[model samples]
Target: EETIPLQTLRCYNDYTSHITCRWADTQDAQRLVNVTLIRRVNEDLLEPVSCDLSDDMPWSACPHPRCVPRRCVIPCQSFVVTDVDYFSFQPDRPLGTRLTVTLTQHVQPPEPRDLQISTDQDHFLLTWSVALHWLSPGDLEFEVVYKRLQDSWEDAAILLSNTSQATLGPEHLMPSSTYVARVRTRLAPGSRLSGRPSKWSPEVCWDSQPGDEAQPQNLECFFDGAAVLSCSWEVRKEVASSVSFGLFYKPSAVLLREEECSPVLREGLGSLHTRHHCQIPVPDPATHGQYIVSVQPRRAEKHIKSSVNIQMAPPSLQVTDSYSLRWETDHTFEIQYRKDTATWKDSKTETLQNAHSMALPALEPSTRYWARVRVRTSRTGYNGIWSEWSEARSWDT
Candidate 1:
């Protein structure tokens, strides 16, 4: 009635993810209000969700027989939580008293993205992109969950700050086999910002092909805006001999399949980290449903087949332009254009804070303009990455 009463007098008993709600009243105040703890199970599952806790919650009350009337010290009570857990809790009536809980640790970083693995040096190289705060030079670290495709998984405590970390020891890429590496950032003690570790990024796998190790092995091919099979991979380096790789497609239905997998270098997109080629020609690339893409990496001397199912496509275009070049991403992108020029020039690069769309000056009617989009992110407040341009789109004035 007056104000959830001394609501902010809260204190925590643990520093882990679990939160233990504390409620207590001065001996005099306990007489006016008391709270019983509650959780649901069994019969409660069938009931409709509503504020009334009567039908469900077999709320159990603590036998406070030691306070004044109840018989115990009502003035102070603190709850301690063990074995951190995640469970939903929604109370019926408004809180009788409120408690203020302050976090001691920083918020966990979001899962790192673009995990990559390569075999250039002795062992494997794991690389990824993390938020800016992750690189500010606090006690920043990473936890890698990696396992041999044929073995049980083990977590590795990797201390990384820069863009990538090198070799988990030949023990991982050791016997020349398929393996996966997953990464999630952590803020060690004394971090610039207090937060829990980030969720593990989507695991990226790589193959330890004798002489031709392909980093970032999993294949999620898309029919780029261009109806081409544009198959791509992260570390398609040629250390020893050139390798031929392509998609072995099948009607993700009956398992029927064909091998149209081509691994030719794509113009302007040939990089050490991104290997692009024509990988998607048919199979309705659009539409939906899971399309199985069996990656066949072959060389004049060796051949290995690995497959990754195509469920979600790359952040579709990561850009859009209507009245404005509407681009939205957690990062940066560029809008480049030219008239029959073969080289990039005077590209307009911008970062997004809120408004995503941008308008271009009026152009002559019926005149054709070529424009494309690409995106990349950096650890600093500045800097960007170079991605393959969206297939050239023509705008007729």
Candidate 2:
């Protein structure tokens, strides 16, 4: 039993035009006298292409019982030869002397070029280019896949025709998450798989901003036979152009009729500079039970809005020991205070003049006292924001 081995397979010129297949008979006797090479392009076999030995010559047996090596070059035109099978024969052989031969493909891997991603309201478009060697445009099929961060790859929503390039769009992806995509090519018209796929593009990541969703904060109410209400929130910077705010009231907590307010655009208060704040005014006290504040980034002729219920409360003061307090009111108001340290607990409130300032009265001689100030308004009760208890102030009587 003698065995013959095929030698080297060579492809040159950037793997574009030519390929050479060489084989040597390593058996002592001149066993193989003829050779035939068969190939299929892009998996198409209807018109199979083949190359036969130029001449049926006897193989010269070597001292080692092996036949001298031979070389053959196959001319491949426009179509890329994805798979090639060969057959060899011996001049004086019994039946079944024809043996199937295998030839390894040595084409360079496909290089991905001109890759791009585009996003619409609800879909992403992917496009790329493919360049091949020794194969025609119709010799390969492509597969594309996409996935979000930490998720398994899923089939692309769009499939391309039997062409070298394709555009894929994924619909209804999760918002505000990162995504990745990849592509591969297979031998067309046949079952031959492509070499390892082209390296995945640097993990294209796109974050679909939150659609028309907003949260509310910084709510306050003032009294003047009517209450003034305001809230603030933020929006995604990429989609900031479509963001807006609205103030809705329904006389009660149940939202019956709603009103939309123009968004008050301003720079955010943080470093990211990605937030916007909005404020609205409610003039009717009768609409005070449960007020709703909503915000949303603008959509196509529609706005996506998220609302929060705000409970109206009576005007009250926030007392801090730091001698500083903030008052919230719906009208022009003032505050005044008096201190008497002579008695461990002696303090009083007086009407604040137009100047909005009041001097302390009496000294405690190195002691501290507490004081209280009430807010009043000509409009009615609760027309002002009150100041809470003040910090202890030391005085030398």
Candidate 3:
């Protein structure tokens, strides 16, 4: 008798009423009729089981020993009924190799199907349907693997487990990037039938939308010391190209139609964050006491709001005397004065409200001093930021 070498043996119980064993790389099918499948009936006894043999060869293949009679199906209960469940592939020849398989470790669920992907504002949703007919949902779980389109499965695959569905978020996914994912079902861990997970389901691919980082930040609009209103904002460099940013503004009087600023300017080279700016003609500051401005993404319903007011001009300072400074303006002012050859920190600072002139009582007759004034709009309805400080004025006391 010649001994047969079995290269590989795989058996699986589909959580159903049958156990199927498939053999591979066996050189002799002429001796397959003599192959006996043995199962452990109890702790100390083994029994020869009768299993059905099927033609595992494809129609296009030859009647080679390696191709025919490679599969065996043994009928059994869906649940484990024997105290010690073990099965063996025995070749009836002297010194023949035998394969031992533990039935408990061989149980696997049917493959899941209908894998689908969807996205909402906050999450990327993944779902699949169960293929097991008689198994309860509570008795099963799943394992899902995903990766970006450009990445390899080994390095970039992300695994999600323990459920039939998955909900990923902006924190886990990048906007505008494409992804591929697949799922497989398994008996729930810690359950009676728990074992290895089933084969993977069909793959699903999807493109993500712009997330939180896609929204523009620090939106600010102001009169740029000219008749044109300038607006600027910041956005992360990663999501900049994923979204189309638009600047919209409307006057208080004409609230019906808003205008978009054209020729938006991009500032700075490629960095962690990109700065964007645009300018639009300023409507009459009197007729439109205030302007509502917003920076929004064209692909998403998200925006940041701000307001624009009449551009404040730098106040002109008049040195009324050796120790006093005056500006002909009704707005608030921040005045700072320092002596020549002294640090700006050594300057005296004062805020003049509803006043035009500021008095410096302490003045050294021999020391030269420099002073500057800037306008603040905290007291007006068209509230805006402070103006640039006026050019330094020098005087000798």
lDDT, candidates in the order shown:
0.49, 0.45, 0.70
lDDT of 3 by residue, 290-378 (tens): 78898876544554333445347888887865367888643678999887888778878778787887777868878878999888665
Who wins the TM-score comparison? 3
What TM-score, computed on C-alpha atoms, does each candidate reach? 0.27, 0.28, 0.31
- Candidate 3's displacement at residue 165, Å, is 1.6
lDDT of prediction 3: 0.70
Alpha-carbon error at 33 in model 1, in Å? 16
Please provide, for model 2 over 138-197, each residue's C-alpha lDDT reduced to its tens digit, 9 standing for 90 to 100: 556666556655455554443534554444333445444455666655555453433443
Model 1 clash tally, residue pairs = 23
- Of candidate 2, the 10-residue stretch with the lowest lDDT total is 306-315
Give the candidate number with the greatest lDDT.
Answer: 3
lDDT of 1 by residue, 41-99 (tens): 24444221212112211222323333221111122233444433222323334667665
Better lDDT candidate (1, 3):
3
Candidate 3 — worst ten consecutive residues by lDDT sum? Answer: 1-10
Determine the C-alpha RMSD for candidate 3 after optimal superposition of all C-alphas: 24.4
